[PDB]
Design a protein around this ligand. Sequence first.
Ligand code: C5P
Ligand code: NAG
Ligand code: NAG
Ligand code: CA
Ligand code: CA
Ligand code: ZN
Ligand code: ZN
Ligand code: ZN
Length: 267
Amino acid sequence: WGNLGHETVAYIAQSFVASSTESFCQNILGDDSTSYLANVATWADTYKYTDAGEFSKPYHFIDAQDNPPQSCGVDYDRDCGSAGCSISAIQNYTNILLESPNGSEALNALKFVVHIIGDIHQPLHDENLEAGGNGIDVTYDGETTNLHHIWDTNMPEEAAGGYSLSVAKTYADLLTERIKTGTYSSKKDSWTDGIDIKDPVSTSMIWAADANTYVCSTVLDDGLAYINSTDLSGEYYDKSQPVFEELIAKAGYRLAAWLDLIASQPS
Ligand SMILES: Nc1ccn([C@@H]2O[C@H](COP(=O)(O)O)[C@@H](O)[C@H]2O)c(=O)n1
Ligand SMILES: *[C@@H]1O[C@H](CO)[C@@H](O)[C@H](O)[C@H]1NC(C)=O
Ligand SMILES: *[C@@H]1O[C@H](CO)[C@@H](O)[C@H](O)[C@H]1NC(C)=O
Ligand SMILES: [Ca+2]
Ligand SMILES: [Ca+2]
Ligand SMILES: [Zn+2]
Ligand SMILES: [Zn+2]
Ligand SMILES: [Zn+2]
């Protein structure tokens, strides 16, 4: 996602973490504001453009070598690759926070986890075709862009009504309501099935596989004749909106559950 989606994921997670988890994170981040996770949720996307952070570019995605929309699937050993991926990064940075939470690496590990759990839930961050859809040029509200970009940025920002941190906070409030009492309230109790702090790869692969299903059902079902030739701000946006909203909600809810397990200690 772009910045709005990552900040939204982070604000949702803040609404679901335990108090002890909130304290654990605020202490690592040096931030006890009511934006502590949202304030770092975009860091990985600035870091990756620097010489020191170039190593981390591949950590934003897992390039699933499936065949959408006919067939979707993610395979860690097939798809991660030698340079690492979102799944290998979740393992590495989770284990830093479990083993060395008071050490110098915990700060960036936490900022990576906050960001990357968000990215796992962007379906085109779980898809090899055309580099996650970057190579698929599209028109969106009369503008030339690409299919990856409209999932990251154009569509979530249209739905949220803007791009800023305060717009993200409002959007997160909306999606948090849908989890607690609204749209998602009868589904969300299943959203952490399979979670296992002892197996970060298995856990994050369940999430990536979930998001990847929507590459076939939603991102590409209409087919590329339609997608290449049509302004995607109309009916394509209308069908995409419920899907990216639920995936942003899932990312925040799952990030909260994961941070709770990272911070957990038996009383
Ligand atoms: N194979 C790739 C290449 C890029 N990406 C994502 O596409 C976006 C644009 O990446 P590039 O700037 O590398 O073209 C980023 O969000 C990046 O994480 C991806 O999801 N799969
Ligand atoms: C784990 O993270 C550290 C710090 O960013 C990095 O140096 C290291 O290469 C990572 N290891 C793996 C296996 O991704
Ligand atoms: C859609 O555009 C992509 C990327 O340029 C291309 O690979 C694909 O063949 C196109 N499909 C159609 C039916 O136009
Ligand atoms: Ca909770
Ligand atoms: Ca690739
Ligand atoms: Zn992102
Ligand atoms: Zn992206
Ligand atoms: Zn990213």
